[PDB]
Design a binder for this molecule. Sequence first.
Ligand SMILES: CC(=O)N1CCc2cc(S(=O)(=O)N3CCN(c4cccc(C(F)(F)F)n4)CC3)ccc21
Ligand SMILES: [Mn+2]
Ligand SMILES: [Mn+2]
Length: 242
Amino acid sequence: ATLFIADLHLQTEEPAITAGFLRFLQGEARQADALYILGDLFEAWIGDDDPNPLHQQIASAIKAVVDAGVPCYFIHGNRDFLVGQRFARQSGMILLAEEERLDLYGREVLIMHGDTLCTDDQGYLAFRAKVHTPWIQRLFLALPLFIRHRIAARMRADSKAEIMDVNPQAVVDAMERHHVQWLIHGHTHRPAVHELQANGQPAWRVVLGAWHSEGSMVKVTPDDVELIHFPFLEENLYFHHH
Ligand SMILES: CC(=O)N1CCc2cc(S(=O)(=O)N3CCN(c4cccc(C(F)(F)F)n4)CC3)ccc21
Ligand SMILES: [Mn+2]
Ligand SMILES: [Mn+2]
């Protein structure tokens, strides 16, 4: 099986999600053919030189999966688009492009984070265009760490003061550009399986869940596609009347 996850939004303020991801990495991921993280692994990222200990704890945990023989891959999300090759080397992860076409046991699948499909949020797309401009990124990354922290903290509060769903035509365009009948993405926090038509044939769009109260993954096997929801921690069973 090949595993897909996204939208964990890891942050030191949410240690239960971190513990859940660590348990996922120690158990399920070790048995996978491969692990793909389709963006928003972290709630924020201001550069690979950030000494945030959560970053090293996560890198070491992913690296243990990689060293166990499971290749791990990363597509950037809207939150953690600054994840770079230093963190890739620390974690053993391979950084992929914003759109990738995979062969999963014979079926061709397009994978992406999903934010680029939400073309009806022109306010977000303007923001995305700005912070994805390379010279703007290079300028931001050159700022002192403590400056980047304050910029990011203010921008998060400014954004706080309702995720738009995908545009149906944008989905078709992407599935026809890549000539695939399968698409896996996250971003929209709406775990689901959708049927559509692309390239004159039935096609499917599979959406990952965010790690809010439970975990979420997509498991692709040679036989089927599985959207799986599971608790963060080990739920120890314990023991009504007739
Ligand atoms: C919709 C959405 O995705 N948002 C909304 C608010 C927000 C914050 C963050 S962030 O905290 O991780 N951080 C902010 C600072 N940033 C950059 C990068 C390049 C240039 C600039 C600047 F300063 F020139 F603009 N900033 C890195 C990312 C991530 C996503 C999101
Ligand atoms: Mn998300
Ligand atoms: Mn997103």
